[PDB]
Design a protein around this motif. Structure first.
Motif, PDB file in Angstrom:
ATOM      1  N   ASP A 216       0.877  -1.201   0.000  1.00 48.74           N
ATOM      2  CA  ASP A 216       0.000   0.000   0.000  1.00 48.74           C
ATOM      3  C   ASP A 216       0.902   1.235   0.000  1.00 48.74           C
ATOM      4  O   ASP A 216       1.839   1.321  -0.769  1.00 48.74           O
ATOM      5  N   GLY A 217       0.657   2.183   0.859  1.00 48.13           N
ATOM      6  CA  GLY A 217       1.540   3.381   0.889  1.00 48.13           C
ATOM      7  C   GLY A 217       2.911   2.956   1.414  1.00 48.13           C
ATOM      8  O   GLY A 217       3.023   2.022   2.183  1.00 48.13           O
ATOM      9  N   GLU A 218       3.955   3.621   1.010  1.00 49.26           N
ATOM     10  CA  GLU A 218       5.307   3.231   1.502  1.00 49.26           C
ATOM     11  C   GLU A 218       5.301   3.260   3.029  1.00 49.26           C
ATOM     12  O   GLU A 218       4.716   4.133   3.639  1.00 49.26           O
ATOM     13  N   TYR A 219       5.937   2.307   3.657  1.00 49.11           N
ATOM     14  CA  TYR A 219       5.951   2.271   5.150  1.00 49.11           C
ATOM     15  C   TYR A 219       7.160   3.037   5.680  1.00 49.11           C
ATOM     16  O   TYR A 219       8.175   3.159   5.023  1.00 49.11           O
ATOM     17  N   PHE A 220       7.054   3.550   6.876  1.00 48.11           N
ATOM     18  CA  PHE A 220       8.183   4.309   7.483  1.00 48.11           C
ATOM     19  C   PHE A 220       8.274   3.951   8.968  1.00 48.11           C
ATOM     20  O   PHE A 220       7.485   3.179   9.474  1.00 48.11           O
ATOM     21  N   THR A 221       9.223   4.509   9.669  1.00 52.46           N
ATOM     22  CA  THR A 221       9.370   4.207  11.127  1.00 52.46           C
ATOM     23  C   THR A 221       9.731   5.498  11.852  1.00 52.46           C
ATOM     24  O   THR A 221      10.350   6.379  11.292  1.00 52.46           O
ATOM     25  N   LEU A 222       9.331   5.626  13.088  1.00 48.59           N
ATOM     26  CA  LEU A 222       9.621   6.877  13.848  1.00 48.59           C
ATOM     27  C   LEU A 222       9.955   6.528  15.297  1.00 48.59           C
ATOM     28  O   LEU A 222       9.252   5.781  15.947  1.00 48.59           O
ATOM     29  N   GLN A 223      11.018   7.083  15.810  1.00 45.88           N
ATOM     30  CA  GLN A 223      11.397   6.807  17.221  1.00 45.88           C
ATOM     31  C   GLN A 223      10.603   7.747  18.125  1.00 45.88           C
ATOM     32  O   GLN A 223      10.546   8.937  17.889  1.00 45.88           O
TER      33      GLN A 223
ATOM     34  N   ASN B 296      -2.519   6.626  15.623  1.00 43.50           N
ATOM     35  CA  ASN B 296      -2.182   5.839  14.406  1.00 43.50           C
ATOM     36  C   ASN B 296      -3.320   4.864  14.110  1.00 43.50           C
ATOM     37  O   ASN B 296      -3.871   4.848  13.028  1.00 43.50           O
ATOM     38  N   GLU B 297      -3.676   4.049  15.064  1.00 47.33           N
ATOM     39  CA  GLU B 297      -4.778   3.075  14.831  1.00 47.33           C
ATOM     40  C   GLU B 297      -6.063   3.837  14.500  1.00 47.33           C
ATOM     41  O   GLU B 297      -6.883   3.385  13.725  1.00 47.33           O
TER      42      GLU B 297
END
Lengths: 42, 42, 42, 42
Positions: D6-13, D27-28
């Motif tokens: 789907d949309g590109e996934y990313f990560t955040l600290q 987020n949910e």
């Protein structure tokens, strides 16, 4: 639709139009989950 | 403190007291960065 | 810059690129206030 | 469940544990609306 006496209601001033639409979205988002949260256990 | 005519102001109803304090925080958070954002380049 | 042992760190996957930039902003926003929050009382 | 592309996934600290749970909720929340957003028009 009985008793709109749920949690006490409040109001908040939000500067900026683009920012407003953003907050409204998160607001409806939580209200959306809250609607399925009060869903009796299947 | 001249011209409160910045971005158009708006209002949003937020149900729940705990939720209200939460939104107010994010609101002040963005307003805080916006204050240092308009900081002329040192 | 001593002890990066502040609050425990965590990670969260955020789908969507536009959404990512949005969360990053709120994250830096809170971190910004937290920086002035630990400001000794003048 | 086909194509997790789907949309590109990313990560955040996200520093702080209490703050983490808060971001996860928003987020949910958006993911929840997105699920009913792709709901074909009845």
């Amino acid at each position: 639709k009985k008793k709109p006496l749920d949690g006490e209601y409040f109001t908040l001033q939000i500067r900026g139009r683009e920012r407003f639409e953003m907050f409204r979205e998160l607001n409806e988002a939580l209200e959306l989950k809250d609607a399925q949260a009060g869903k009796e256990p299947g």
